[PDB]
Every structure is written in structure tokens, then in C-alpha cells.
Design a protein around this nucleic acid. Structure first.
Lengths: 120, 122, 56
RNA sequence: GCUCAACGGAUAAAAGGUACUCCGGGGAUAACAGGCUGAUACCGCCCAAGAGUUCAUAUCGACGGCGGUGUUUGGCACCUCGAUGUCGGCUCAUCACAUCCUGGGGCUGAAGUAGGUCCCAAGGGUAUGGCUGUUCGCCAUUUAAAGUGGUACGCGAGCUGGGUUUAGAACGUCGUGAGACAGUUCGGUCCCUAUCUGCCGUGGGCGCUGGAGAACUGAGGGGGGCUGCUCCUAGUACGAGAGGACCGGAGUGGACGCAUCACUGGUGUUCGGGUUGUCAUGCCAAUGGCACUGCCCGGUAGCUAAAUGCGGAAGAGAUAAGUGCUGAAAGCAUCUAAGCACGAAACUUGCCCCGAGAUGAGUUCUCCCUGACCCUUUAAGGGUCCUGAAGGAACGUUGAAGACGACGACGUUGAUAGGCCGGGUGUGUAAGCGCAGCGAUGCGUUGAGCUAACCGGUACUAAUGAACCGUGAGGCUUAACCU
RNA sequence: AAUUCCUUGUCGGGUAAGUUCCGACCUGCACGAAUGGCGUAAUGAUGGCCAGGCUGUCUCCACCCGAGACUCAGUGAAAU
RNA sequence: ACACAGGUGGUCAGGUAGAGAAUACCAAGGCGCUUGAGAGAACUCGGGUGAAGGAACUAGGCAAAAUGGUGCCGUAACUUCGGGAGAAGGCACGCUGAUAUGUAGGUGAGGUCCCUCGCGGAUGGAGCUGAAAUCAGUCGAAGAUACCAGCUGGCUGCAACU
RNA sequence: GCUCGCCGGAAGACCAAGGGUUCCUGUCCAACGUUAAUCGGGGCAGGGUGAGUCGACCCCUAAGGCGAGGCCGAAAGGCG
RNA sequence: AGGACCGAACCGACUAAUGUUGAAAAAUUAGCGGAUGACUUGUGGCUGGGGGUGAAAGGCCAAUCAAACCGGGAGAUAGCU
């Protein structure tokens, strides 16, 4: 049912999800690999790939982005020079999802989410 | 909409500013009145020189409502400020000597079809 | 309103005859190692698709 | 020598209250319900004084009598003291027929329109408000019916607390009094996660006999079935005359069931725009975090009724009451005895849906596989190898399906999910630049900018080869024909 | 009448109708003078009533967002 | 009795908004409530928005929603003169820059002048704080813009009110 | 460590009354701690709170208590 | 000036939203009368069981009250389960 809703509801309030995904997507650029859960990681591509594609267009009016949606205070000094010129040209697919099964003795679907470091 | 306890103005003369709607009737589960549906009404302030008196219960038809009338083609023709015409239950036709507002011709049932034969431009 | 007779040890088995959430069913083969892994999942030792990833 | 008279003498010597009661007990003992009863009752009939101008039975009915029912008024005390919570309401129907509306037949004091009114039948159909806790009774307004009834006189592991109902208290009255009134008025508590039968939906095992894929028959079941008002058919039928109708329709309203998103409004916290407060961003432009989504206004995708659409059929078969023919027993008379027809709004087939666990398990088409060995306390088991089809499922990408399973797509022979690059509906011309302007700000570039479901292209990123299950022509008996 | 048997009186007004509201009647079955009688303003955890304002209480529900319920996993009660 | 929302006296106080010790946002400082991952179901509990009618709902406006600020106007009957009164009802509200690159009220000096040269004795009115008025423009559908924050008139019985 | 949220007349900060080792930080994680546990008023070892001016003691004392001699009551006990 | 308005603390408890093997054997959430007075409240003391106290309900006196608790009379008495 859920009428027309196509995005999954996961865990916590929509407000907590907003900030958790904001914090995870910005930090994955520096961590390169994050360990988390499969349902959560399958929705991370929806916010971390457009953050890398944000450096595909070049303009003095494009540097004020990542300030109203998916804020991070440190990528805004390096990302436009590092991944904008050649990597962001591919406009998506920068992520690898690693299905790892159980974490320990509990029930949580464990996953690792990483960024591709070389395209060829 | 025009339902129970609705307080509205009369389209005939001598009826005064206020009359009250007191059930729709004519079948099972009857609620709300559309344009040209007969409703039961009570008179409250009527002019002393008029043919009708206070607390005597009559039949009336809706002539103004924002649900309008769409029977001719599906396009809705609407009216501002809810209003009714007073109907004779025995001799038929309206009971006034004048009528207010611009009115409509879709009131075509023979017991009130005389409404197009009056002073209005319709 | 409440239990007035204890359910039988046959009824116990009638409610435990579908209790296995995992059987567990057959594995999948790698592509550069003589190793095997769970269907669409990387092993706890890092083996998957001939990639050997995030190993310990 | 005692009305010690409660008399076989409880002390010489003794009345009440308990809604503040407590304890030992109780259907030994009460109000409701089920049964039992039917005097009473409701319903109909036999009798038919007398009424109906005349005339008993068109329509009614005295003085009296019977039968049917469970059915009011009232009894028995067999089921309750280890509790079947009190009246009405709302929710919710379901059964009866002494039929209320619908149908079938008829007498009328029924010329016609209406009216009066009795047999036959349970398919379909039968009102809301005021004061009032009251359903009810009264009233207001409406019906085709608002019919007469049963259902623990249908309502609490379903609800409200108004009636009923204590412990606060008052008015009236009574009882020295403590209490008392099914008198009166304010006020006065409403507990409950399911074991199994009853149910609704939904998995897995087993049966249908080689395995697999699928479409057809149809034992039997359910759904459909009602109608007010007016206008036409018809000033035709009838009847001095006034007036004024059948068949079958249409116009306008309804119950009830059933389906949609095109209309139209609403909603629409994944889209857009404006705005108040305050903190963050050094500060400002500008943009977030929180404040009922802070507040305000539009609105896609979609839901939805406050919107739109729709209905009870013909042919064939067979049926109480009623309509019957030819005709005897009983010369006649008769629907019945011999012999054979008509027919209702009801009903079987027909239509729409279910349905072969229809263990009575039916049919037919499309697809596939043409194998061996060792041992034994075996007419049966336990081991190993060759070779596994057609197909199915898991595992995935998820959805028109969903609580979970099940189930519809798509897994690179790919459009299934996500993304990119656009379009569209929706919003409303931005953040910048240029000019004008004290400045707030306006106008031009600009129908700007932004986007999610709607629509298009695309493999950009992800759905791996396999592995797994599924085996080698498939048990037993009979008949005929060709050999 | 918080008092009323006929009584939900009778009648005027207020309603579509009112066992209620306001007033008038006297025939108070049983008001009545500190056992208190009549009477008025602000006020009042006050009973009853009329009109308007404002409203999803209703007509009639419709859509939107959470928690518990649902699924698996963890550590694991009760009447009966 | 429980890593129990219950009980518990004294002591200190801030930006901005606010009359406030209410309340929104936040600083200093403190903390993330000692099971986890998902699904997106009726249903229950809590929230949001709602057309046109309107108390018809119900024993009964119970409950809920609307209103709600300030300044300037306007104010009934009844009355024991004290009340009723917020009667009832009306009009307005943002921003810009100029007179004055900030006027006047509060605060108040370099300076000037005096004497007993000093917690001195006057005076002028820069600096600081800063209304309100007057004039002229400008924007949104909406300026009290968020929090915060009124139902009113008219009878009757009871009760004098605290 | 960072980033985000919540409290901010408190969920910040300083104390009494009461509790009596609970504070501080070294080690273990068998048992206890409705999840893990490398952590915890846990198991186990050690360290810890120093006053002429705060309080008591010390000097007064309200309500009140105890109360010589004396009195009331069989006595206990009471009055004062 | 106020046994005065609006309105916190401070006192109450007219209400609805929940709870009812609760988070809690009398609580929580959101409104609400009193709010300088016959106000409210901390500390210490005095009053005792047929005895105390109450602007008065048969209310309050360690969950009980037409009379709270304990040791003893005591193995009270029960035409009864």
C-alpha cells in the first residue's frame, strides 16, 4: 500500500535521518570506507554521489553549494580541485557496496560502503 | 449545501430576511438540497401585509447555492448567498407577486415552471 | 477467558515444525581462489567474486 | 399463691436501628431470564338478538360457545447464593406470518376514479425530530409499508452514566427516634494482553498415481430480483352527468449493491514561493537548525465523495391457492377415480462469479528422460558409480501484490530498482548582472530558477558463471480385435 | 415551588413540536414568618432556558505525520 | 522493594524576544534517557489540514476550534454610588531616508568663570543613551505576522461576596 | 576526535537533612548489571576528606522537657 | 488603601487526554478557581485509643477507624463450613 511512497523508512525520525545522512556522506570523502548496515548504505548513494557530481559543473557561482543541502565544512576546500575535473565527469557509480552478512552474534545486516579511487 | 438549521433569505416578496430549513424529505436518507430540490421551511419574520404568517410550515425550492446547476452540459453555473422560492403545496406555482435576484430557467418541473413567465430577464 | 488445560507435547511439535529461519542452503564459488561463500555475501575472511576484499 | 397465657413453668426483672455494619452460613430464602401453565391475553371462527332505507352474513355485531398461539396480566419454584451487571439509546440484523408495501383470486350497498374488505404465498421492500433517561405515551412533519410479533420481552470480556443507586445534602410528608418514600432536586466510580469451538484472510505438509507446462468441462453454491410522485399511452374504457382508469413507457426522486478518478472541491510533512522570532555561517548579501510542517499560500503523483457511472432480460423447462378439459364411482353432477392441459412478483436452465479433496479427485493439448554394479540372517534392505531432461525454486533488482508468507515484473539474450540527461504538470521570474532610485525597491536579460511520483532516451552503478532441487519411458486386474 | 395527588396542571409568550424556559391562575390534598418571611447589586469550581458569535460535536468523514501493534534477533513475567 | 516519570528544604543567575520567576530560540556549563536492525498493516494512543452547511451532535456547546497584542476612539440596562466595564462595537499596525549623517526627556564633558585648589563651587550643553512627531517614498494575497495571548448579549431559581 | 541533536530559571552551578564508601584510578569480567561490555554505587587492591575565625563543645534561651525540698496517687507514675 | 481584577511561584483539584497484571497499589499530560489573605510554608514542641482533634464528613490519628498496632489472658465462644 503506502499510496505512492517509494523511499524506504529505515530507523529513527525523518529529522535524525536527515542529519545522519548529511554527516555520513560528508565524512565518507575523508574516511574512504565506512562500516554500517545494508538498508542504510543502499540509500547513501542517493546523497553521496550527487555531492561528488556537484564538482562536475565549473563556476564561481557553484562554490556556494553544499551549504543548504548535504553541508560539510572541509570538502568545500578540496573536492572542486580533486574530483571535479576528471572523476565527477562520470556523473555517478562512484560507490561500491560490500554485503558482509552478520556483524557478530546479533541480527543486523552488516555492510561496508566505499568510494572508487581509480577509474581505469 | 443547504441543510438542517440553515438560516437564509427568501426570493419571493413579503417573506423577510430570515427563514429556517427544517429537513429535506421526499424519500429515504434525505440530506442536503440542490437547485430545484424541494425542502421543508419555517417562516420567522414575514411582513404583516403578506399572505403567510410566523411558525406556519411550508415547502420551498433552492434557487441559489454554490454547488450551482450542471444538468445542461456538465459545466457548473453557481450562485452567491443561499436562497429559496416558496411553493404552494395544493394549487402549485410560487406564492409572491415579485421575485428577487437574476434567477435561472433550469427550474422546469410543471409545479414551478411559471418562474420563467415573470418580470426577470430569464 | 484463560488457559484451562495445558497444550500437549504434540502441539509443541506442531508449532516447531517450521522453526528453521535458515536451513542452511548451498554456497557459491569464487573466481581466483579455491574458496566458497554465502549467496550474494562476502565471507568474514574477505572472499567474493575473485576480489578478496576488506580481509583481516 | 402469677393471662409466669410465648400456657412443658428460659431472669424476680428487658424495646428498637444498621445506607458505617462485621463475622458463620444460604436458592434451606428473594427480583430478572429458560422451561412448565394458558385462567388472563392476542388472533380467527360457531351461534346471529339487532344495525345496514328494504335486507342478518356488501360491511358489522349482542346474549353465549369453541379452536389456534406462547403472547401480554398472573402463577409453580425444576437450572442462580464459589454472581447469566440494572431501563431506554447507538451499533447490528435475523427469523416468523394471524401479509404491512409488492403479487394471485374475489364480494361489494364495485356503474367509472377512489373507497369498504376476505382468502393464498416469506422472493424483494417498510420515518425523523421536540420536552422527556426514557423506547414508549403526547406532538410536529413525512411513507409504497412507517404492519402485527419472536430473538436472555434480541444492547457492557461492545459503548455512554441519563433512568436505577448507596456514602455529602435539601424540599415536602410520615415515623417519639436512630430512618424512611420504585416521592422530589443538585451531586456522586464503568476492570479485562484471549486456550478452544465460532469466524476472516493467509503459508507449509499430504492426496489426485512417470515428471513437467497450461487451458477446458461442471457435481453443486452465491449474486441479480422493490418502488413513491407526475406526464404520455387516454377525455380512450365507464357513467344522466360531474369526473376519470388498465397493458407498456418516459420525466424526476429514493432505498440497496457494485465500479471508477475523466469531472470538481478537499488533502497532498519526498515539489515551489512568501514571512515572524532566534541561534549559526567573522559581518553583510544569501542559506540552514529549532520554534504545532513555527506561520502563510499554491499544488504534481495518488487517495476521496463533499464527485461521476450503473441494475433486477428474452428463449427453453417445471411449480401451492387459483384457471381446468373429457369423465366414472353416485344415469345426473363433478378438476380425479382411469386419462390429459393452463399458471405467480416465486423457481431450474439461460447471464455474472466461485467450483474436480466432485477421494465419484473428469478432459485435452504443448514439453522431456530410453542406466549399471557389490553385499545380506534378502521375495526385502543397506552401499557405490554413470547420467540428470523438460521444469521449479533459492539467491538477487523489487512491485501494479502485502502485517508475515504467497504472488505480478526484470537478472546483462537486461528498462526490474537507483542514477544521469531532458520533457511535462506544479510553482512563479530567483541567487547574479545591467540600469533607475536617498533607499526600501522596480524593470530588462527572464515564461527565470527549482522538482517527486507523470512521460522519453540511457545500461551510467547494481541484479556472476554456476551451485541447488527435479532422474533414466514410469503399479495391479480384465475384455475384444488383428497376430 | 427542589414542596403538587388528577399534574408531563390550565392559559398567554418563546419551538416545526417543549415531561423543560418566562409570566399569569388559586383549588398551597402538605410554602409561611429566626425552626425565619419577602427583596435587590458586584460576585459565585451553581441547577434550568432564549438569541447571536465561533466551531469536524454533527451532515460524512477524507487525506497527511509519529509511537505501540507487525518481522527477525537480544536478555526474558502473570492469573490459570 | 526495581539503574521506579512518585516524595523531598536552603543557595546563585545571562543573551535576544517578554510587564514577568510565563514562554520561544540560545550562551556558559551539562547531557544523548545502559537492547538492536527493518517493514510501512487494520487497529489503539498522540499529532497535522480540511470544502459547503452549523449544534442539526448529545441528557446537555461536553469536547474542540475561533478570538487573543498595543495605541486612539466608543460604551447599555441594572445599581446598595462602590460596581456593571474588557460593556457592546470601531480605526490602525512592515520597511525605507530626511529634518537632526540622533530632535526632545534621562545622563553629561573638553571649556568658561569663582573661591577657603578640592570626595569643591557654579555654568554652558559636545560625548553617551535616545522617544515621539512631521514630510516623502516602497513591498507581500497576508505586517500583532512566529511563540505568548478574551466568547458575547438577555431571563430565572439558589447562594450576600472572600 | 569530529559533526548533529536535547536541557539551558536546567537536564547548569553551590549546599543541608538523610545515606555511610557510594568519591579518585589500577585490574578482572568467572557471578551481578531485562543489549555488547574492554564500562558500572559489581569481583579485587590501593588512595582519600587536615580549621583559633563554618558548626558543635563553649556562652544564652522561646515553646517545651527533665524537676531537690514540698505536694498528688495503693505502688509504678504524675504536679511543680 | 484594599478578607479587589489579569496572572507565575505558592495553595487547591472543576475538568478532559492517557493509565487500569500501570512507568506509578492514588501517577502522568494539557486546561482551570485562590493568589497579601479568615494567605502559604520549613523547623522544634505538646495532645493517645472509647482517648485526642475537626469553619463538621461519622472526617483525621503509620493503607484499617460504629474506634490504628503489639505481648498476654488464649488453644476465648461457634446448634456452623
Amino acid at each position: 500500500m503506502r499510496h505512492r511512497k517509494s523511499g524506504r523508512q529505515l530507523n529513527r525520525n525523518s529529522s535524525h535521518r536527515q542529519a545522519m545522512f548529511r554527516n555520513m556522506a560528508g565524512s565518507l570523502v575523508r574516511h574512504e570506507i565506512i562500516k554500517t548496515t545494508l538498508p542504510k548504505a543502499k540509500e547513501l548513494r542517493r546523497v553521496v554521489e550527487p555531492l561528488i557530481t556537484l564538482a562536475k559543473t565549473d563556476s564561481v557561482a557553484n562554490r556556494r553549494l553544499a551549504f543548504a543541502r548535504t553541508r560539510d565544512n572541509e570538502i568545500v576546500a578540496k573536492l572542486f580541485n580533486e574530483l571535479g575535473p576528471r572523476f565527477a565527469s562520470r556523473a555517478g557509480g562512484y560507490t561500491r557496496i560490500l554485503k558482509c552478512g552478520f556483524r557478530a552474534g546479533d541480527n543486523a545486516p552488516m555492510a561496508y560502503i566505499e568510494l572508487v579511487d581509480r577509474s581505469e | 449545501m443547504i441543510q438542517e438549521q440553515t438560516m437564509l433569505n427568501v426570493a419571493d416578496n413579503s417573506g423577510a430576511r430570515r427563514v429556517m430549513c427544517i429537513k429535506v424529505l421526499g424519500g429515504s436518507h434525505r440530506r442536503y438540497a440542490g437547485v430545484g430540490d424541494i425542502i421543508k421551511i419555517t417562516i420567522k419574520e414575514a411582513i404583516p401585509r403578506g399572505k403567510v404568517k410566523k411558525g406556519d410550515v411550508l415547502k420551498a425550492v433552492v434557487v441559489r447555492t454554490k454547488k450551482g446547476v450542471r444538468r445542461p452540459d456538465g459545466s457548473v453555473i453557481r450562485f452567491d448567498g443561499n436562497a429559496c422560492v416558496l411553493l404552494n403545496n395544493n394549487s402549485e406555482q410560487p406564492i409572491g407577486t415579485r421575485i428577487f435576484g437574476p434567477v435561472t430557467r433550469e427550474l422546469r418541473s410543471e409545479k414551478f415552471m411559471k418562474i420563467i413567465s415573470l418580470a426577470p430577464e430569464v | 477467558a484463560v488457559q484451562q488445560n495445558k497444550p500437549t507435547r504434540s502441539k509443541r511439535g506442531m508449532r516447531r515444525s517450521h522453526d528453521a529461519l535458515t536451513a542452511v542452503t548451498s554456497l557459491s564459488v569464487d573466481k581466483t581462489s579455491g574458496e566458497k561463500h554465502l549467496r550474494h555475501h562476502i565471507t568474514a575472511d574477505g572472499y567474493y567474486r575473485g576480489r578478496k576484499v576488506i580481509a583481516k
